[PDB]
Amino acid sequence: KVFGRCELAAAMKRHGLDNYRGYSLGNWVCAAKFESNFNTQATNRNTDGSTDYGILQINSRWWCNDGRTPGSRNLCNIPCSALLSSDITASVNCAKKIVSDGNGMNAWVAWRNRCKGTDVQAWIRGCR
Ligand SMILES: [Cl-]
Ligand code: NA
């Protein structure tokens, strides 16, 4: 599923992401823009052999099990494939755990380099 900008904002808000760990909805929509271009089916392999999965590109190195990342953990206790569903519930639940892990949204390198400190409210501008 390729979400619309305000469609995804509304889905994140309904799953309790807005203001979560103090990160406004625009921060989450911006992160998803640059991680997945709003595509729930996005996957990208990392140089170390782990893979990032879904709307928020959650890494198999720590958070989901894809069965092919040696030495990884599954701290969200989910198959990585469940992070590719059109329903974003699993991705939100796991992102809440990631963003609580200590470094906030800096866990998302694309958030740090492309959203952090910018006018993230623009990402939810015009959304109902
Ligand atoms: Cl923080
Ligand atoms: Na893993």
Experimental determination technique: X-ray
Tell me how far apart the alpha carbons of residues 113 and 33 are, in angstroms, rounded to a whole number.
13
Q: Where are the domains of the chain?
A: 1-128
What is the 20 CA–ligand 1 centroid distance (Å)?
Answer: 10
The residue annotated as part of the active site, out of 7, 18, 48, 52, is: 52
Q: What is the C-alpha to C-alpha distance for residues 104 and 116, in angstroms, rounded to an integer?
A: 11
Residue list for the binding site for substrate: 101
CA distances from 113 to 28, 97, 109, 127 (A): 14, 21, 6, 25
As for the chain, the residues directly before each break of C–N over 2.5 Å are none
> What 8-state DSSP symbol labels residue 85?
S
Q: Which two tokens stand for residue 74?
A: 């599954």
Residue 119 φ then ψ, to 5°: -80, 75
**Do residues 118 and 83 touch, judged by C-beta distance below 8 A?**
no
Q: Of 7, 18, 35, 66, which is the active-site residue?
A: 35
Please give the torsion angle defined by the CA atoms of residues 91, 17, 89 and 116, in that order, rounded to the nearest 10 degrees: -20
**The CATH number of 1-128 is which of 3.30.70.20, 1.10.1060.10, 1.10.530.10, 2.130.10.10?**
1.10.530.10
Torsion region of 126: left, alpha or beta (phi above 0 gives left; psi -120 to 50 gives alpha): left
Q: Which two tokens mark 71? A: 């030495």
Q: Of how many residues is the chain composed?
A: 128
Known active-site residue 35: yes
Instruction: Please state, in angstroms and as integers, the Cα–Cα distance from residue 79 to each residue in 10, 51, 57, 98, 115, following that order.
Output: 25, 12, 14, 16, 28
Residue 109 CA to residue 98 CA, distance in Å, equals: 13
